[PDB]
Nucleic acid binder design. Structure first.
Ligand SMILES: [Mg+2]
Ligand SMILES: [Mg+2]
Ligand SMILES: [Mg+2]
Ligand SMILES: [Mg+2]
Ligand SMILES: [Mg+2]
Ligand SMILES: [Mg+2]
Ligand SMILES: [Mg+2]
Ligand SMILES: [Mg+2]
Ligand SMILES: [Mg+2]
Ligand SMILES: [Mg+2]
Ligand SMILES: [Mg+2]
Ligand SMILES: [Mg+2]
Ligand SMILES: [Mg+2]
Ligand SMILES: [Mg+2]
Ligand SMILES: [Mg+2]
Ligand SMILES: [Mg+2]
Ligand SMILES: [Mg+2]
Ligand SMILES: [Mg+2]
Ligand SMILES: [Mg+2]
Ligand SMILES: [Mg+2]
Ligand SMILES: [Mg+2]
Ligand SMILES: [Mg+2]
Ligand SMILES: [Mg+2]
Ligand SMILES: [Mg+2]
Ligand SMILES: [Mg+2]
Ligand SMILES: [Mg+2]
Ligand SMILES: [Mg+2]
Lengths: 52, 187, 147, 234, 122
RNA sequence: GAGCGUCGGGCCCAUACCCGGCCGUCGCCGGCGUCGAGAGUGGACGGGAGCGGCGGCCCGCCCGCGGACGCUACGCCGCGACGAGUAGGAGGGCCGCUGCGGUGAGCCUUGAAGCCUAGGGCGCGGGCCCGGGUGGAGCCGCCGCAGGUGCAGAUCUUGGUG
RNA sequence: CGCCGUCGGGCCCGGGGGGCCACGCGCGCGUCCCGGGACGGCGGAGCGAGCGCACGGGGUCGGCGGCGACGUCGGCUACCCACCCGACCCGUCUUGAAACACGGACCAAGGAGUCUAACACGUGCGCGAGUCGGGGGCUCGCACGAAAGCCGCCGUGGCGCAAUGAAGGUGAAGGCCGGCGCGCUCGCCGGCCGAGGUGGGAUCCCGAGGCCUCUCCAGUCCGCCGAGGGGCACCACCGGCCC
RNA sequence: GGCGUGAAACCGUUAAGAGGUAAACGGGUGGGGUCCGCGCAGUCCGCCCGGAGGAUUCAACCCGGCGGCGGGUCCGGCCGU
């Protein structure tokens, strides 16, 4: 619930005076479990039925 | 040879949880530390319930937790339920009671914090009461599953209160021979 | 997943997990519901009691359409409205009351439980039940039918 | 700094506490060791007394021309003879109760009229008789294995008997011998403390293993001659 | 959340080698080679690594800055040591022990600083 | 008597029993104190009075800059009893084959796949790694995903040789 | 009454060798024997340093020693051979197979529990009295896009929240302090909380009580804690309510 | 000229070894052969000190200068809750 600030870089790899507050998705849980379930099923939608 | 005894040697008790949830895997790493190092028996029982499956951790509805906290002498302790706490819209009073659960449901978080109460989890619960001092444990209706009314001696024998399997209720589904006396026998 | 199976474990074994002696063949006890009355009565009775016979009157062209009344009980009765109104019905005013309409939320018949909110109400419904109607008369509320 | 140097003046008080803590531990276990020295003196006076009584009683009976008969001895050592396969249902259960589940391991048995009719039921499967003090003196010392939770632990020390068994007053090993030998009021929990005596096969060889010891063979009661056998199987 | 990073990466990372034997960490900041919690150098806020010197002679030592996290250009500060095999043994002891900066893994820093000079000196 | 009977002392050996090594399974456990500075089955105070004894003149860290190994938490260590198995059921597999996202700043015309091999080994095992010889253009690891995925048998099918 | 007992009771006893995990006189705290002795405590006061060595003591170390080249040193295997002992040919039905039971000449490749639907228990994950886009629409028509993202006045509906009856249909709150009638096989009137009770019941709380160097004198404190208390999940039983 | 790699059955020759209880197999060593490894009795590795011989530059201890870690007022601000 405590959210730092992240700079906004230029076209040259250099800071600018603007600073954005880090939005709350980057504090959310890290669950490679649920990724590994959802990635396993959403990869399957892609496929064609493949010869019969 | 040795035994004219059998072998029921290996217990069936669950030791590591089958779940791969990282956040549950850190609460286990915290709580397996405590239960061997405190000479406390609360911390045994929570560590069992973190292992336990999702059938055997039924959700507290919100008004069971109230009605088991207003019992006398318990206004001043903090409730701990391992498992989810959901909301009850049957009730109207919500007091300022203390709650410590895994994954309080969202509309239940507001109605606690409207009532000015305090919520915790087990990273926070361990700091206040490592021994579980001052903490009422609860659990939901483990038999309260829909299924457990199917389980009896048989579904027809002295009627046994069974809820038989059927494709849908009505007339013309499991009524004539056995469910009444004129059409044969009456179980 | 054919990689998590029982088949992939049981290769190398002869009978593939169906017995040398009994010999899993095709359909030993018939197909489907064969011989319910004859040789599977200890299954049909004692597990599906009442499967055979008739009980009632026939009704031709049964529509699920003239028997439509979703119920409600007096637990959920306050839950149709924002609970803004039950505060402003408890605001010490007079016998002024919210007119809760259950027909709007889809609920026709109001059944009853115990323990209804003390504040006075007006319910507008198509059907009532007299225990629930005894409960709304308990709190000094009113009971209005819509047609 | 000045605060930690103030504690190093106080450290001479601290190591006095370190001295004092090691000190009472020394003089507990010293005077707890002097106790074990004198309880064995009392027993060595006692077993001399109980042994010489049975001589002294009989000798003034025979003088006056009258028979002395001794009390029927109240402790039998039982060792199992036969095997496992081919076991009657009634004797299946009984040899479990006497902790004789495999072959050639044995316990002590409190003799009693309830316990006598057990030993008729398992007559072909055991060989048994009243021991001597010397036999019990060897078994607890040489083959002393005791269980604590489960897990039979070799005895090896008197601290094992102090915690696990001295609830009644038998903290050392010679108290364990007296309670086993003279059946007292706590023979039950001392006998439950010992694991079954996992002996060897006998040196000389048995004699036919099946018939009673009355029939010249080897099974059954023998009343002193199991002292002859327990020198073989030890 | 260092243990959060561990419970993701302790398997299924990149540059993790499982051939014929134990896992190996093979990570750009690490002293020993084991895929372990303590000898893991992306995870911790305070990490110690030593490396060879691309100058040809010497030992370079890598430490994380602890001031600015999530800023991986500036997050490392490095310094080389080229001394007479005994003063470079003590200087790495001074920099580890005489700070709070990881009193764990003292020796593993040194044994690598032991070993990497002997590869380098003849 | 190398027969029969009643016997005595020896002596012989089974995967059984004792003791010891080792693996595995099961039970009961242990270390997040990596604490060379922590040491708690009882520990702080300032008071009113005291002696056993540090100073009666009978009155208040560091010569050393130093100290091994551990702990994939699904890691490791400890102690103890246990192991037979058809039909069968579960578990573990860094066992193999083939295809797909991911990764290996992987691999190779300076020789990949295969195949052969009195060559060197590893694993209890499934199977693998290494050398040599052949060939001449692609192939394998680890984490996940997906199988038309593992043969001695079916008077097996087709091919081929005795 | 005596008599017998390597008796026993550490009996005691009064003088006159072995042995004992046995060592305060100076005199006091009680008992005892006719002043010493023994002690639970203190009046005596173990006047500490363990400084050294052995070690049948928590599973072996040697701070012991030799002897041998340019054809001899060690070695393990799916290499051969000798020999002792063991040793019938595999699948299959079967009460039983080396079977005078069946199939099997020999090698290579092919080759046999799959997929869709539906139900059930079990388990992981998301939400929670709610859940679900599964059918449609919106995104620009961007290779991978036959993907993915969005809707919410698209939640129609499915399954669940409510049951029972052939059907018309009806459809789940009691407990506490008073009052009215003959206060009875007896129902009604007014407040006050609002899901009953009993036995079991993890955990939690209160804990008398003592426990740690002179002493008093005082609060924290750790741990043990008799007994007591409100009691979860759940089981056994009673009461109630709906049809 | 069905001409890539060209396995196994089976056959040919060369080499080695064996031959009365059909062959083969398990356990046990043995003999021989084979390469392999060592270098053939001539094999330890690096650590520390007290000795012998040539060269470098410290440490301390201060001054030069960089970078870094470690603390309390909230200190000097922000922001946190
Ligand atoms: Mg056994
Ligand atoms: Mg089988
Ligand atoms: Mg099966
Ligand atoms: Mg049959
Ligand atoms: Mg079958
Ligand atoms: Mg039918
Ligand atoms: Mg037999
Ligand atoms: Mg002999
Ligand atoms: Mg014999
Ligand atoms: Mg087995
Ligand atoms: Mg591979
Ligand atoms: Mg491979
Ligand atoms: Mg395929
Ligand atoms: Mg197939
Ligand atoms: Mg087969
Ligand atoms: Mg065939
Ligand atoms: Mg032919
Ligand atoms: Mg056969
Ligand atoms: Mg025939
Ligand atoms: Mg045949
Ligand atoms: Mg044939
Ligand atoms: Mg094949
Ligand atoms: Mg499910
Ligand atoms: Mg709807
Ligand atoms: Mg060709
Ligand atoms: Mg070619
Ligand atoms: Mg080509």
């Amino acid at each position: 619930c405590a959210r730092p600030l992240i700079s906004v870089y230029s076209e040259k790899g250099e800071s600018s005076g603007k600073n954005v507050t880090l939005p709350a998705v980057f504090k959310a849980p890290i669950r490679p479990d649920i990724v590994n379930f959802v990635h396993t099923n959403l990869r399957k939608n892609n496929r064609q039925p493949y010869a019969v | 040879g040795v035994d004219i005894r059998h072998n029921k040697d290996r217990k069936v008790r669950r030791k590591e949880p089958k779940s791969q949830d990282i956040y549950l895997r850190l609460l286990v790493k915290l709580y397996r530390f405590l239960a061997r190092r405190t000479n406390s028996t609360f911390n045994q029982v929570v560590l069992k319930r973190l292992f336990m499956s999702r059938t055997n951790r039924p959700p507290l509805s919100l008004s069971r937790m109230i009605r088991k906290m207003k019992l006398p002498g318990r206004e001043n302790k903090t409730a701990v339920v391992v498992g989810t706490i959901t909301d009850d819209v049957r009730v109207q009073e919500v007091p300022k009671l203390k709650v410590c659960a895994l994954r309080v449901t969202s509309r239940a978080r507001s109605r606690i914090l409207r009532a000015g109460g305090k919520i915790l989890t087990f990273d926070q619960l361990a700091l206040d009461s490592p021994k579980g001092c001052g903490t009422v444990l609860l659990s939901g209706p483990r038999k309260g599953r829909e299924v457990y009314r199917h389980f009896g001696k048989a579904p027809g024998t002295p009627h046994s209160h069974t809820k038989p399997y059927v494709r849908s209720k009505g007339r013309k589904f499991e009524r004539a021979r056995g469910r009444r006396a004129s059409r044969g026998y009456k179980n | 997943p054919s990689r998590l199976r029982k088949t992939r474990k049981l290769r190398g074994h002869v009978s593939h997990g169906h017995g040398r002696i009994g010999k899993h063949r095709k359909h030993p006890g018939g197909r489907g519901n064969a011989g319910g009355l004859h040789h599977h009565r200890i299954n049909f009775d004692k597990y599906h009691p009442g499967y055979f016979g008739k009980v009632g009157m026939k009704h031709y062209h049964l529509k699920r359409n003239q028997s439509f009344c979703p119920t409600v009980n007096l637990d959920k009765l306050w839950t149709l409205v924002s609970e803004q109104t039950r505060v402003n019905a408890a605001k010490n005013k007079t016998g002024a009351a919210p007119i809760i309409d259950v027909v709007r939320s889809g609920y026709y018949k109001v059944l009853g439980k115990g323990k209804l909110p003390k504040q006075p109400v007006i319910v507008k419904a198509k059907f009532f039940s007299r225990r629930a109607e005894e409960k709304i008369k308990s709190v000094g509320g009113a009971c209005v039918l819509v047609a | 700094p000045e605060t930690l140097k103030k504690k190093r003046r106080n450290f001479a008080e601290l190591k006095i506490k370190r001295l004092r803590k090691k000190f009472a531990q020394k003089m507990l276990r010293k005077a707890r060791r002097k106790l074990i020295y004198e309880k064995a003196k009392h027993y060595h006076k006692e077993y001399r007394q109980m042994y010489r009584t049975e001589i002294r009683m009989a000798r003034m009976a025979r003088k006056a021309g009258n028979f002395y008969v001794p009390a029927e001895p109240k402790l039998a050592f039982v060792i199992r003879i036969r095997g496992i396969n081919g076991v009657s249902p009634k004797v299946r259960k009984v040899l479990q109760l006497l902790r004789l589940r495999q072959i050639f391991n044995g316990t002590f048995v409190k003799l009693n009229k309830a316990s006598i009719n057990m030993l008729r039921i398992v007559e072909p499967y055991i060989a048994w008789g009243y021991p001597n003090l010397k036999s019990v003196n060897e078994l607890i010392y040489k083959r002393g294995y005791g269980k604590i939770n489960k897990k039979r632990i070799a005895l090896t020390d008197n601290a094992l008997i102090a915690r696990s068994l001295g609830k009644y007053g038998i903290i050392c090993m010679e108290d364990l011998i007296h309670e086993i030998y003279t059946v007292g009021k706590r023979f039950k929990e001392a006998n439950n403390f010992l694991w079954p005596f996992k002996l060897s096969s006998p040196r000389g060889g048995m004699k036919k293993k099946t018939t009673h010891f009355v029939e010249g063979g080897d099974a059954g009661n023998r009343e002193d001659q199991i002292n002859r056998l327990i020198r073989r199987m030890n | 959340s260092a243990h959060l990073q561990w419970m993701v990466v302790r398997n299924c990372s990149s540059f993790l080698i499982k051939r014929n034997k134990q896992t190996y960490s093979t990570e750009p900041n690490n002293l020993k080679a084991r895929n372990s919690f303590r000898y893991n150098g992306l995870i911790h806020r305070k990490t110690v690594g030593v490396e060879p010197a691309a100058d040809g002679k010497g030992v370079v030592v890598v430490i994380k800055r602890r001031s600015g996290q999530r800023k991986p250009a500036t997050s490392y500060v490095r310094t080389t040591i080229n001394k007479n095999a005994r003063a470079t043994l003590s200087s790495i002891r001074h920099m580890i022990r005489k700070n709070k900066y990881r009193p764990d893994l003292r020796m593993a820093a040194i044994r690598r600083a032991s070993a990497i000079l002997r590869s380098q000196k003849p």
